[PDB]
Structure 1
Amino acid sequence: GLEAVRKRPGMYIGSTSGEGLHHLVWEIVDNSIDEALAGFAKSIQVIIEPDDSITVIDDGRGIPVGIQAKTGRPAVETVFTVLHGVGSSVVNALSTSLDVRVYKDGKVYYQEYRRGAVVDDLKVIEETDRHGTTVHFIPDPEIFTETTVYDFDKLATRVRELAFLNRGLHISIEDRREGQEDKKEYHYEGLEH
């Protein structure tokens, strides 16, 4: 399964250099873009956390949490744990840790993984009035041996491109790292312009 991804990451993300490190971001963001395309997500936030980890927040419907008959597991768990807009499990495999929060039907559903392996069963941890999905991941330095340090300008450039290609979407990029905090927000207007 996902162990194959950890041993041959080059076959799944193209490179284990800085390029592959940034590719992880797009693999998660692309899923949020698909939910904007479906018509539900209106805003996406990408955050470089102070420790070079990544958070992606959207306000879509939230990844399905119901048990699938085919697997006997919550759909969201399968998304991150089974190899398949299909790259979530690859990001999981290549991260020291990944946590997902799904905001759906008044509840926050939470699951975490470590180097691709499930920590515990999906659990309701809070009540909420919002909807969407938040994915946070820490890229694995065992995989990304050259660099685990993000390039804000590189991310911002593509985020702007994504805003343009998905006209109407609100998408932002934020750097929370020490001595260089920054945020850029992008939104190209539709017919209301």
Structure 2
Amino acid sequence: GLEAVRKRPGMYIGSTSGEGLHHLVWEIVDNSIDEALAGFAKSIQVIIEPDDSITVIDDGRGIPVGIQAKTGRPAVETVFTVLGSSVVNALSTSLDVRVYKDGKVYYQEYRRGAVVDDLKVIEETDRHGTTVHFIPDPEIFTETTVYDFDKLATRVRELAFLNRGLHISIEDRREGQEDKKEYHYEGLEH
């Protein structure tokens, strides 16, 4: 399972250098992209947190939270624990997911890929979507755990263009360099 990912990360993310570090972002963002293609997500936020962790927020339907017959576990748990999203989980010190669905916020967290506790309703909400936050593991990313805002922004812009109509932003919250760029290419309303 994911134990193999932690021992051979090069086979799953291509490189454990800075390139692999950034690849984790795209693996998560690609899920939000898929939910935009499904027609439900309209906006995606990518945030570099002050500690070089990453938050990705979409306003889609939210990852399914029901128990799957095949696994006996909530669908959202399987997304992160069974071998892109599960690879990011495995290579992070911690990953937390919040699903905003049916007036509830469903929460689960993992540590170096391992489940902390069963999925739990933690809050009520009026919004919908999925928020994933992860802290890349320096035991894996031994060269660098520092994100490149311009590198992320460049690809986010490309992604906005390829997914015309999508709102996507990138934000840096790190000390002395706070920045944000927002992208949106218009559809037929142009």
TM-score of the superposed pair, with normalisation by structure 2: 1.00
Q: Report SS of the residue matched to 2:164.
A: coil
Q: Could you list the per-position Cα deviations for residues 140-176 of structure 1 after superposition, in whole angstroms to 9, with x for gaps in the alignment?
A: 0000000000000000000000000000000000000
Task: Report the Cα distance in structure 2 between the residues aligned to 1:94 and 1:48, rounded to whole angstroms.
Answer: 17
* Aligned-residue offset at 1:16: 0.1
Q: Could you list the per-position Cα deviations for residues 9-28 of structure 1 after superposition, in whole angstroms to 9, with x for gaps in the alignment?
A: 00000000000000000000
Q: What is the count of residue pairs matched by the alignment?
A: 190
- Gaps in structure 2 of 5+ consecutive residues: none
Q: Could you list the per-position Cα deviations for residues 52-79 of structure 1 after superposition, in whole angstroms to 9, with x for gaps in the alignment?
A: 0000000000000000000000000000
Aligned match of 1:139? 136
Flag as ranges the 4+ runs of structure 1 deviating above 4 A.
Answer: none
Aligned match of 1:111? 108
* Aligned-residue offset at 1:120: 0.1
* Aligned-residue offset at 1:187: 0.1
- Gaps in structure 1 of 5+ consecutive residues: none
Please give the root-mean-square deviation of Cα atoms over the aligned residues, in Å.
0.1
Task: Report the Cα distance in structure 1 between the residues aligned to 2:86 and 2:187, rounded to whole angstroms.
Answer: 33
Q: Report SS of the residue matched to 1:168.
A: coil
Q: Could you list the per-position Cα deviations for residues 39-63 of structure 1 after superposition, in whole angstroms to 9, with x for gaps in the alignment?
A: 0000000000000000000000000
Task: Report the Cα distance in structure 1 between the residues aligned to 2:130 and 2:115, rounded to whole angstroms.
Answer: 18
Q: Could you list the per-position Cα deviations for residues 52-110 of structure 1 after superposition, in whole angstroms to 9, with x for gaps in the alignment?
A: 00000000000000000000000000000000xxx000000000000000000000000
1:14 is the counterpart of 2:11:
no
* Aligned-residue offset at 1:136: 0.0
Report % sequence identity: 100
Task: Report the Cα distance in structure 2 between the residues aligned to 1:16 and 1:165, rounded to whole angstroms.
Answer: 27
Of 161, 170, 185, which aligns to 2:182?
185
* Aligned-residue offset at 1:4: 0.2
Task: Report the Cα distance in structure 2 between the residues aligned to 1:183 and 1:58, rounded to whole angstroms.
Answer: 17
* Aligned-residue offset at 1:179: 0.1
Task: Report the Cα distance in structure 2 between the residues aligned to 1:168 and 1:78, rounded to whole angstroms.
Answer: 30
Q: Report SS of the residue matched to 2:79.
A: helix
Task: Report the Cα distance in structure 1 between the residues aligned to 2:78 and 2:128, rounded to whole angstroms.
Answer: 20
* Aligned-residue offset at 1:5: 0.0
* Aligned-residue offset at 1:111: 0.1
Task: Report the Cα distance in structure 2 between the residues aligned to 1:98 and 1:188, rounded to whole angstroms.
Answer: 31
Q: Report SS of the residue matched to 1:56.
A: strand
TM-score of the superposed pair, with normalisation by structure 1: 0.98
